Amino acid sequence: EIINFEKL
Amino acid sequence: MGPHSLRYFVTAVSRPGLGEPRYMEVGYVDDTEFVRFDSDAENPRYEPRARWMEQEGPEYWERETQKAKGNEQSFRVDLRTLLGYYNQSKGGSHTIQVISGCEVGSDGRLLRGYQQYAYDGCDYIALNEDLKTWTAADMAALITKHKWEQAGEAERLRAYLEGTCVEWLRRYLKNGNATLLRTDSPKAHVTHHSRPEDKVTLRCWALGFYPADITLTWQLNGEELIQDMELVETRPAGDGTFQKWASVVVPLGKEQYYTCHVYHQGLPEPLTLRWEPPP
Amino acid sequence: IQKTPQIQVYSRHPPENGKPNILNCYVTQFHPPHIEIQMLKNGKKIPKVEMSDMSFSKDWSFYILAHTEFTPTETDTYACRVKHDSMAEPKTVYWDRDM
């Protein structure tokens, strides 16, 4: 299960 | 079962004027792909392989599809953000890639965590070994660094790494553990090829092996020929298995003085072969 | 930056004349991911070439496996031709059945 990515 | 890894490979590629960015999430267990999201479809969804499907249920993959589309759109913004950071024209194609995941030891405990970013194929920013601080690669990534340092992004990742990531990995095995079941020993043979004059080439082949890691060596009466040896990068056969070869140029008539050695985790012990001419 | 593709062309199984086999063209070490790959039989594009999904490795470089069905003969010449932004001109690599 992949993480939720956060804005760069 | 020794150390194990869960890793996601993420690609976001803009193509201005030619459509929306192409987004992909690819999940690997022990370097075996087990799931893939590809945004390049009318109604795109997570495509788990048979095992993870229905050994997890439809609801779950539905929710991961929705999380994938969420990530997709967040990355869309990021591509625009990075144009600004680097003062790049809006008309060119650019890529962002992530490797994200964890590795556990045989005790089930987290060994290593992965959260690393690249822009146009160069390192951008990465979570350090300490799982607390970040390595920015350049001035643009310092902007991302400061921002994440403020929001406590590192702590957000430790929780995922030590919680969700690690637990998924523990769940996979027991249940399965299919990389030793997927272990295939190389089958080796030596071929013989003519060079100019009084030299010949002996080529040691390893075929049909998995996983990809392998070693081939040539020995002249004990003592690896640590040079003069040619080889190719290990390469896929396309049926799941891999191939490699190593060759040496030896004198004509002296082929029986050379031995090929093949080391692969699938083998009861290293293979040892010579050129066998038919009679 | 931009990385320059490396190419290998080789059969799935040891080739023997007359026996259906598969011809691979394995392209690695390239970036950006847009790449144009074709396989050629005796100078002419083979129309039915199947592509793997594209992946990338730890160093960020992409890779992909093109392949096509073939039955080797003593004389037919195969090649794989790759067009990619890192290269002024298309790189071509010939199948050598000893490699």
Side-chain angles (χ1 to χ4, degrees):
Chain A
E1 186 177 312
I2 202 167
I3 199 169
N4 307 274
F5 295 98
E6 191 86 333
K7 302 296 178 79
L8 302 182
Chain B
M1 194 281 277
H4 291 293
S5 68
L6 167 62
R7 294 167 98 206
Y8 290 96
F9 281 57
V10 176
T11 305
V13 178
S14 66
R15 35 177 194 158
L18 311 187
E20 293 297 295
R22 285 163 162 176
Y23 182 84
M24 203 134 40
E25 295 174 9
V26 171
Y28 298 91
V29 287
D30 287 334
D31 309 346
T32 287
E33 170 173 334
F34 73 95
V35 69
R36 178 176 288 260
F37 176 86
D38 188 339
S39 74
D40 226 28
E42 291 184 355
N43 184 9
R45 76 186 170 280
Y46 253 67
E47 307 281 26
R49 293 198 182 271
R51 179 178 165 175
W52 296 260
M53 198 174 287
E54 235 44 58
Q55 290 295 151
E56 188 60 61
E59 288 186 339
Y60 175 80
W61 298 116
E62 152 73 344
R63 300 185 313 266
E64 299 292 299
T65 296
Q66 290 309 306
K67 166 153 65 60
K69 293 155 74 167
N71 284 336
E72 170 178 344
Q73 299 287 320
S74 185
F75 279 81
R76 206 287 161 267
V77 170
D78 292 332
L79 288 160
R80 294 180 353 228
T81 304
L82 290 182
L83 284 180
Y85 288 179
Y86 289 101
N87 192 29
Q88 281 163 350
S89 151
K90 296 192 180 64
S93 173
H94 298 275
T95 72
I96 291 171
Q97 307 166 259
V98 197
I99 296 178
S100 186
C102 56
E103 177 180 46
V104 305
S106 57
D107 59 2
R109 284 266 281 177
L110 177 82
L111 264 169
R112 249 205 298 169
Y114 308 112
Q115 183 79 344
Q116 42 213 25
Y117 282 70
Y119 184 59
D120 292 330
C122 300
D123 289 344
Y124 180 80
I125 199 181
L127 185 66
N128 298 146
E129 64 305 308
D130 61 20
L131 307 181
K132 304 173 184 295
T133 69
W134 304 95
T135 298
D138 62 18
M139 289 305 295
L142 266 183
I143 304 179
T144 292
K145 181 173 182 178
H146 173 89
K147 174 155 45 182
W148 288 357
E149 283 183 341
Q150 298 268 133
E153 174 68 358
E155 305 99 277
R156 189 180 78 82
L157 260 121
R158 171 203 253 73
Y160 166 84
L161 287 175
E162 298 177 335
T164 302
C165 188
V166 152
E167 289 167 347
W168 187 106
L169 211 35
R170 286 186 205 128
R171 183 168 25 254
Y172 159 84
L173 65 179
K174 11 69 188 300
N175 294 180
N177 197 347
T179 306
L180 15 54
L181 283 304
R182 200 175 154 187
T183 288
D184 277 327
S185 286
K187 296 179 186 296
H189 69 284
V190 174
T191 55
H192 187 284
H193 316 279
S194 72
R195 297 292 299 124
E197 305 300 280
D198 51 353
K199 305 286 174 275
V200 300
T201 294
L202 295 181
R203 171 155 298 121
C204 189
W205 291 83
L207 297 181
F209 59 89
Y210 183 96
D213 307 83
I214 192 168
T215 307
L216 272 38
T217 76
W218 271 105
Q219 290 184 24
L220 166 62
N221 301 325
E223 285 315 317
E224 283 169 40
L225 297 155
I226 314 179
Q227 194 208 8
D228 298 18
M229 164 164 304
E230 192 181 354
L231 53 61
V232 283
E233 281 294 303
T234 301
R235 62 200 197 191
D239 64 8
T241 78
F242 293 85
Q243 304 179 353
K244 205 188 179 62
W245 65 245
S247 57
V248 281
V249 179
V250 308
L252 183 71
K254 301 305 183 190
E255 295 94 326
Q256 298 306 318
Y257 295 55
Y258 294 75
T259 294
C260 174
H261 292 258
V262 181
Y263 309 84
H264 186 265
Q265 82 205 43
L267 294 166
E269 65 178 86
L271 294 175
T272 298
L273 325 69
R274 277 184 179 87
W275 162 240
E276 332 247 24
Chain C
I1 47 54
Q2 291 194 351
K3 311 290 179 188
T4 288
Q6 305 304 307
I7 304 158
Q8 296 194 239
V9 196
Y10 57 100
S11 54
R12 166 176 305 167
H13 310 280
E16 40 198 315
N17 296 330
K19 304 201 186 172
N21 200 327
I22 303 276
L23 187 60
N24 293 322
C25 173
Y26 185 45
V27 194
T28 50
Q29 298 313 122
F30 65 86
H31 201 298
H34 180 252
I35 197 155
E36 300 182 351
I37 303 174
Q38 57 188 359
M39 301 173 72
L40 307 168
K41 176 181 185 187
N42 293 329
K44 270 124 40 270
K45 183 174 183 284
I46 307 183
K48 199 172 188 59
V49 172
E50 178 173 337
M51 298 279 164
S52 76
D53 296 301
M54 201 185 292
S55 311
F56 76 82
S57 47
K58 294 197 315 161
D59 77 350
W60 309 118
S61 82
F62 292 91
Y63 67 87
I64 192 168
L65 175 68
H67 78 269
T68 193
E69 302 202 280
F70 84 125
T71 303
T73 66
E74 189 69 325
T75 54
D76 292 321
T77 300
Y78 299 83
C80 185
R81 175 165 285 152
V82 178
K83 184 176 147 196
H84 181 266
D85 299 324
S86 67
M87 292 186 303
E89 314 282 337
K91 192 153 76 159
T92 303
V93 166
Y94 287 87
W95 183 49
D96 180 324
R97 76 166 66 213
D98 292 342
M99 297 187 143

